[PDB]
Write a protein that binds this ligand. Structure first.
Ligand SMILES: C[C@@H](O)[C@@H](C(=O)O)[C@H]1C[C@H](SCCNC=N)C(C(=O)O)=N1
Ligand SMILES: [Zn+2]
Ligand SMILES: [Zn+2]
Length: 229
């Protein structure tokens, strides 16, 4: 049930939730997929993560216009890497309010990214401070601790079986944890398990670079990270 729209792919995961997928050719290595989410919440649409580029992210907004036909109220991006924040200009051009971890926004210029318009901050237990995430509807944002990057955050979709681990979680068939260039290998395992504990009701785990998996993806990722300590 994958729908193609331009160079992007869209898959419905639940009555009010879709996965968006965009690709970037990396020289010598080929096209890399990156996933994010689109959530219908009453009379508005919420987006998790941009596509790799501005042009691709504009196509997400175009797809939303056609298939859902409701205004995009806000977007949350899960850390300061190109696959998650590469298309920020397309959102700001459309007047969509954007949110990121304060640390992601602090890092964005160093990473060549455009910072989100707004900053999220987090309690010592990892849950977002409600004052920084107003009107997020079903999006429950959790900072699990450093892992894939120092700033990585995760999102559960309230009222569904779905939680989004971003680039922190790999699927149960994954060989490696991928890019460890920016990673915290000491705390990764604990951060992956913290994401699992934060969303115990989630049975469908969506991640950046694999099709949705079961909760086994969290545990398998944690046990791979265990060996990096
Ligand atoms: C380019 C960056 O956005 C990078 C990142 O988020 O750090 C992307 C691409 C690699 S894909 C490598 C996975 N390899 C699997 N065989 C990756 C990942 O492994 O999570 N994320
Ligand atoms: Zn990343
Ligand atoms: Zn990634």
């Amino acid at each position: 049930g994958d729908q193609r729209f331009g160079d992007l792919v869209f898959r419905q995961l639940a009555p009010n939730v879709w996965q968006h997928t965009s690709y970037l050719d990396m020289p010598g290595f080929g096209a890399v997929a990156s996933n994010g989410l689109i959530v219908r919440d009453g009379g508005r649409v919420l987006v998790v993560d941009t596509a790799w580029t501005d042009d691709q992210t504009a196509q997400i907004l175009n797809w939303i216009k056609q298939e859902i036909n409701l205004p995009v109220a806000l977007a949350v991006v899960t850390h300061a890497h190109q696959d998650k924040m590469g298309g920020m200009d397309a959102l700001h051009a459309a007047g969509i309010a954007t949110y990121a971890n304060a640390l992601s926004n602090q890092l964005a210029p160093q990473e060549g990214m455009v910072a989100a318009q707004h900053s999220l901050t987090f309690a010592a237990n990892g849950w977002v401070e409600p004052a920084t995430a107003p009107n997020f509807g079903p999006l429950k944002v959790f900072y699990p601790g450093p892992g894939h990057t120092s700033d990585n955050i995760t999102v559960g979709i309230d009222g569904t079986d779905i939680a989004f681990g971003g680039c922190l979680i790999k699927d149960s068939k994954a060989k490696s944890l991928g890019n460890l260039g920016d990673a915290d290998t000491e705390h990764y395992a604990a951060s992956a398990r913290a994401f699992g504990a934060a969303f115990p009701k989630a049975s469908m785990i969506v991640m950046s670079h694999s099709a949705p998996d079961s909760r086994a993806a969290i545990t398998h990722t944690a046990r791979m990270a265990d060996k990096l300590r």
